[PDB]
């Protein structure tokens, strides 16, 4: 797991730097991504592959990594930069995607459509779906991530575009099923034996591949495009 | 007494296809029964070098034990060996050949490796390994942190240097990658030396044997 400073102060113009410390099972050897989450909206990929900006990201965000610790750097610090910053990577030994706890910063094209924002009793199950348009899950991994209110991001699992094989994070194996109907360009996350622990906003995201021909974990180098989120309450 | 390979091909069984621990570990056999269309072989697509020769040499065997030639937890301290693949999925989950390990980078590095093995088992030892061919240079950097890589296997009868061919292919079993598989018989007394700075699909288990 990845340690982030819980908080970070900044004043306009000034340059601020979030840090992310990991083990070698992660960060050390695998690519690190940074996500930004403003309220109401969905998390946004700032940096992937340690230091790469995806298009649409200001030259203001820079990323670096040294040994077992990565760093997000904001240089011209606007006010609209006030949000939660997260830090992500694969962890060998856990064999899962793994998120930083979050840093709150305080100051002074393909599209995915999830659906079915809904309510449910404990003990039941939910099936969220996510439909693609002007793009596909054909050569890309898709991730499911949730955020319980006032909590960090949490990886439920993924779909690898080889035989449509699922991959379930430790905490969730047995409760989660992830499937695809590629005729409809949709991916489906079904979580069962629910509880209030699970009330959250659920997201569906497509992964930038680091490598298409290697071991699975190279499919997940960064979630560049997100659904809108689906709220689920118990 | 004949040896059934079920729905597996000699490639799968001998490589350690995940759909191939299957089976009743046998110590000896006279001939080998295998379907003409075996469904579980090279789970990860690629060419198996001198395959027909290997099938003959294994057609008749008097002794056969699997053993861990390069132990997973002490051989590769500077390289990542955990990787698994959906191309080799057992029961639904991703996995890999039991007799091989996919070495990839660790701590941002893929140090030059050279590991050796001396045959002390007083029997011929069959040693298998693969070489990985990624479809582009982006993958190559991601897995091994080097654009120009080599693998070199050398014994007293065997001497070859592989450079990976990097370009577009057709998808077999949803894969663009290829792993080419290789094998040599290691006579009691000889020593085999692997050297690489990338792309080595390293042996994990090997086999001691005799043929009558
Ligand atoms: C193997 O036999 C055929 C394919 O070879 C298939 O119908 C069947 O499911 C398989 N069963 C075994 C032997 O696992
Ligand atoms: C083994 O056969 C089964 C059933 O045909 C197939 O689903 C699986 O992909 C095969 N194993 C490999 C190497 O993929
Ligand atoms: C890497 O570290 C291992 C630890 O056992 C060591 O055996 C090996 O020689 C090192 N590789 C070199 C010398 O670059």
């Amino acid at each position: 797991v990845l340690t982030q400073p819980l908080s970070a102060p900044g004043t306009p113009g000034q340059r601020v730097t979030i840090s992310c410390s990991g083990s070698s099972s992660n960060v050390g050897t695998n690519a690190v991504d940074w996500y930004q989450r403003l309220p109401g909206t969905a998390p946004k990929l700032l940096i992937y592959y340690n230091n790469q900006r995806p298009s649409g990201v200001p030259d203001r965000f820079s990323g670096s990594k040294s040994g077992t610790s990565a760093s997000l750097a904001i240089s011209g610090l606007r006010s609209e930069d006030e949000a939660d910053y997260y830090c992500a990577t694969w962890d060998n030994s856990l064999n899962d995607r793994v998120f930083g706890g979050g840093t709150k910063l305080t100051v002074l094209q393909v599209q995915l459509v999830q659906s079915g924002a809904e309510v449910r009793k404990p003990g039941s199950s939910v099936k969220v779906s996510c439909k693609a348009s002007r793009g596909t899950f054909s050569n890309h991994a898709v991730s499911w991530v949730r955020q319980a209110p006032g909590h960090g991001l949490e990886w439920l699992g993924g779909l690898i575009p080889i035989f449509s094989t699922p991959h379930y994070a430790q905490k969730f194996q047995g409760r989660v099923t992830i499937t695809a109907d590629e005729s409809t360009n949709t991916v489906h996350m079904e979580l069962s034996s629910l509880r209030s622990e699970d009330t959250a906003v659920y997201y569906c995201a497509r992964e930038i591949p680091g490598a298409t021909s290697g071991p699975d974990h190279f499919f997940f180098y960064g979630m560049d495009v997100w659904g809108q989120g689906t709220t689920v309450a118990v | 007494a004949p040896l059934q390979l079920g729905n597996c091909s000699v490639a799968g069984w001998i490589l350690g296809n995940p759909e191939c621990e299957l089976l009743i570990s046998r110590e000896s056999w006279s001939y080998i029964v295998e379907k003409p269309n075996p469904e579980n072989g090279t789970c990860y697509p690629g060419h198996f070098a001198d395959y027909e020769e290997l099938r003959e040499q294994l057609s008749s065997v008097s002794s056969f034990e699997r053993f861990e030639i390069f132990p997973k937890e002490s051989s590769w301290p500077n390289h990542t060996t955990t990787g698994v693949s959906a191309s080799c999925s057992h029961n639904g989950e991703s996995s890999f050949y039991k007799n091989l390990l996919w070495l990839t980078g660790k701590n941002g590095l893929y140090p030059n490796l050279s590991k050796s093995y001396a045959n002390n088992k007083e029997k011929e030892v069959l040693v298998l390994w693969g070489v990985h061919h990624p479809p582009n240079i982006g993958d190559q950097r991601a897995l091994y942190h080097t654009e120009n890589a080599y693998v070199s296997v050398v014994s007293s009868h065997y001497s070859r240097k592989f450079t990976p061919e990097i370009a577009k292919r057709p998808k077999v079993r949803d894969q663009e990658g290829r792993i080419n598989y290789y094998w040599t018989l290691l006579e009691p007394g000889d020593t085999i030396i692997f050297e690489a700075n990338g792309n080595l699909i390293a042996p994990r288990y090997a086999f001691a044997l005799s043929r009558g």
Side-chain angles (χ1 to χ4, degrees), chain B residues 9-12 14-18 41-51 54 85 87-88 96-102 127-133 153 158 160 162 173 175 177-184 194 199-203:
Chain B
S9 80
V10 171
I14 207 53
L15 286 177
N17 180 305
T42 37
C43 64
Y44 196 109
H47 174 52
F48 193 11
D50 290 285
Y51 181 39
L54 184 73
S85 170
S87 292
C88 306
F96 205 49
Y97 305 105
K98 301 200 217 46
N99 305 331
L100 319 163
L101 277 185
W102 199 327
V127 175
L128 308 105
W129 68 96
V131 180
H132 179 243
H133 304 283
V153 193
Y158 204 105
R160 200 144 163 208
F162 322 84
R173 293 182 183 174
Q175 258 303 335
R178 299 291 182 273
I179 293 170
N180 284 340
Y181 313 91
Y182 300 99
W183 72 266
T184 181
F194 293 86
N199 307 73
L200 171 58
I201 315 300

Side-chain angles (χ1 to χ4, degrees), chain A residues 118-126 192-196 232-234:
Chain A
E118 66 201 347
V119 192
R120 220 158 296 257
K121 341 255 207 305
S124 54
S125 71
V126 182
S192 69
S193 271
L194 293 158
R195 44 198 188 260
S196 62
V232 187
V234 205

Side-chain angles (χ1 to χ4, degrees), chain A residues 50-102:
Chain A
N50 303 325
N51 54 28
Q52 304 284 314
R53 296 184 290 275
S55 58
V57 169
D59 79 295
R60 263 167 56 235
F61 302 94
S62 82
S64 66
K65 174 172 100 175
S66 184
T68 66
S69 175
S71 307
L72 178 58
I74 293 100
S75 50
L77 182 59
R78 308 251 268 268
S79 318
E80 342 315 320
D81 295 341
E82 185 175 64
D84 301 297
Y85 293 89
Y86 300 94
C87 156
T89 205
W90 199 265
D91 184 81
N92 310 332
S93 82
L94 226 53
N95 204 17
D96 285 332
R97 222 172 189 317
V98 128
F99 281 110

Side-chain angles (χ1 to χ4, degrees), chain B residues 74-79 111-112 115:
Chain B
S74 62
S75 306
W76 309 115
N78 293 327
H79 297 78
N112 297 320
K115 298 183 71 68

Side-chain angles (χ1 to χ4, degrees), chain A residues 6-46:
Chain A
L6 189 42
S7 141
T11 64
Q14 167 208 11
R15 159 181 178 268
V16 69
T17 316
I18 319 308
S19 92
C20 169
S21 281
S23 159
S24 167
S25 335
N26 55 64
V27 189
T29 91
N30 298 328
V32 164
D33 354 321
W34 291 89
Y35 301 86
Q36 163 199 88
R37 190 232 167 78
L38 298 131
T41 89
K44 151 177 191 173
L45 179 57
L46 287 189

Side-chain angles (χ1 to χ4, degrees), chain B residues 168-172 175-178:
Chain B
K168 346 169 172 311
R169 294 183 181 277
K171 312 182 28 182
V172 192
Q175 258 303 335
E176 179 136 13
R178 299 291 182 273

